[PDB]
Amino acid sequence: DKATIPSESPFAAAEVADGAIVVDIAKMKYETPELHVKVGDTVTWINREAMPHNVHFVAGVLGEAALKGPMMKKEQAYSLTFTEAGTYDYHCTAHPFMRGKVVVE
Ligand SMILES: [Cu+]
């Protein structure tokens, strides 16, 4: 696998620690659609909207299986720790027009 999952289910935005690498989900978009991080960094998505959202990486991208993240309710968060360099495209399962990528360098 190319990422580890600190928490399989979502957690409160507030519980996100100061200085976390946050991608906001707001205005029906991933507000940083192309994020560049380094190996070992944790990325945290935070849903700011009433509509639930997730992140979904198809099979072969983060590992063998698809990573279909849990739906974050408003003001919930979800993290992935990237362990290997690459470019990792994702979308929202419910709203597949919402697309982003994490470039791990
Ligand atoms: Cu979404």
Q: How far is CA 13 from CA 9, 23, 29, 46, 66, in A?
A: 13, 11, 17, 6, 25
**Residue appearing with tokens 């906001």:** 24
Distance in angstroms (rounded) separating the CA atoms of residues 33 and 53 = 14
Distance in angstroms (rounded) separating the CA atoms of residues 14 and 6 = 16
**Domain 1-105 CATH (choose: 2.60.40.420, 2.40.30.20, 2.40.50.320, 3.40.50.920):** 2.60.40.420
Q: Name the token pair of 73.
A: 């309710």
| Technique that determined the structure | X-ray
- HSE of 24, CA atoms in CB hemisphere, 13 A: 5
Alpha carbon of 88 to ligand 1 centroid (Å) = 17
Alpha carbon of 98 to ligand 1 centroid (Å) = 6
Q: Name the token pair of 65.
A: 């299986």
Distance in angstroms (rounded) separating the CA atoms of residues 55 and 76 = 13
- Say whether 98 counts as a known binding-site residue: yes
- Say whether 91 counts as a known binding-site residue: no
Distance in angstroms (rounded) separating the CA atoms of residues 59 and 65 = 5
Alpha carbon of 16 to ligand 1 centroid (Å) = 20
Alpha carbon of 78 to ligand 1 centroid (Å) = 13
Question: What DSSP string runs through 6-61?
Answer: S-SS-EEGGGSPTT-EEEEEETTEESSSEEEE-TTPEEEEEE-SSS-B--EE-TTT
Distance in angstroms (rounded) separating the CA atoms of residues 25 and 104 = 20
Phi, psi of 14 (to 5 degrees): -65, -30
- Say whether 56 counts as a known binding-site residue: no
Of the candidates 65, 56, 1, 4, the residue with the CA atom closest to the CA atom of residue 25? 56
- Resolution of the experimental model in angstroms, please? 1.0
- Say whether 92 counts as a known binding-site residue: yes
Alpha carbon of 95 to ligand 1 centroid (Å) = 5
Distance in angstroms (rounded) separating the CA atoms of residues 39 and 103 = 10
